[PDB]
Amino acid sequence: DMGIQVMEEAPDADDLMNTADEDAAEAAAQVLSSVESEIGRTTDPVRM
């Protein structure tokens, strides 16, 4: 969501095309740094 897109292999080798700007970057980094602080899940109603 903030970049960078996780393809499953080596490519982007010679594809030099940046829609990932910009306020989403620090917020998404915050959310990622927080996901370790928890263990989940709060996303499946069934499991909750």
Partner 1 sequence: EFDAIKIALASPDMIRSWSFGEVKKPETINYRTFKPERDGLFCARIFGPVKDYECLCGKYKRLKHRGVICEKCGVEVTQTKVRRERMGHIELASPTAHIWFLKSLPSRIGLLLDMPLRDIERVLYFESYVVIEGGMTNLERQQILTEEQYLDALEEFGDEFDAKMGAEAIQALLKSMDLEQECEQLREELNETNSETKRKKLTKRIKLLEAFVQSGNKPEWMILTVLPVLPPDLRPLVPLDGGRFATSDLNDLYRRVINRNNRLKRLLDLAAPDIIVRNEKRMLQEAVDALLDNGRRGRAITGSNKRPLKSLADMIKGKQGRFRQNLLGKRVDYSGRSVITVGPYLRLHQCGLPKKMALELFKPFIYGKLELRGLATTIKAAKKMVEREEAVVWDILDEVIREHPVLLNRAPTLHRLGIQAFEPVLIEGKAIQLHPLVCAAYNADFDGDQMAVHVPLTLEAQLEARALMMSTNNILSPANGEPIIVPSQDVVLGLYYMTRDCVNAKGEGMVLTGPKEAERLYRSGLASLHARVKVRITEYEKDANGELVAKTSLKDTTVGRAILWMIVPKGLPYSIVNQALGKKAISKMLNTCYRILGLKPTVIFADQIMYTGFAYAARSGASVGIDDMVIPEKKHEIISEAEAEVAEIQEQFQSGLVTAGERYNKVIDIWAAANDRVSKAMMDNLQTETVINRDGQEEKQVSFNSIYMMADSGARGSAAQIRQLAGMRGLMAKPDGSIIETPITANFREGLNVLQYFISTHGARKGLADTALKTANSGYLTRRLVDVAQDLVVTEDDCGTHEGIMMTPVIEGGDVKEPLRDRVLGRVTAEDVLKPGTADILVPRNTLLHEQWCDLLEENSVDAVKVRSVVSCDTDFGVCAHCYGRDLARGHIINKGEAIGVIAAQSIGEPGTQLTMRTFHISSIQVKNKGSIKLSNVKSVVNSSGKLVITSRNTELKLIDEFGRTKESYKVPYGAVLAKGDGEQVAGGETVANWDPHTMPVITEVSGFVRFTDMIDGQTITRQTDELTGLSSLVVLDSAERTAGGKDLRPALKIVDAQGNDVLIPGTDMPAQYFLPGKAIVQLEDGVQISSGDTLARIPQKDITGGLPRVADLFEARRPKEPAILAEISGIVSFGKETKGKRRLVITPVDGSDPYEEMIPKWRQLNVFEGERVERGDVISDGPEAPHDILRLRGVHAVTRYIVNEVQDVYRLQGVKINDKHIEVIVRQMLRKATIVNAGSSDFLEGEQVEYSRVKIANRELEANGKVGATYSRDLLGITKASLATESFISAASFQETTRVLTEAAVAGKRDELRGLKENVIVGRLIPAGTGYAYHQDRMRRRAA
What residue has token string 């292999």?
Answer: 9
Q: Which of 5, 34, 36, 39 binds partner 1 (CB under 8 A)?
A: 34
Of 9 and 14, CB closest to partner 1: 14
27 touches partner 1 by CB under 8 A: yes
Two structure tokens written together for 47: 């499991």
Q: Which of 8, 9, 10, 23 binds partner 1 (CB under 8 A)?
A: 23
Gaps (C–N > 2.5 Å) in the chain: which residues precede them?
A: 17
What residue has token string 């970057």?
Answer: 25
Coil, helix or strand at residue 32? helix
29 touches partner 1 by CB under 8 A: no
48 touches partner 1 by CB under 8 A: yes
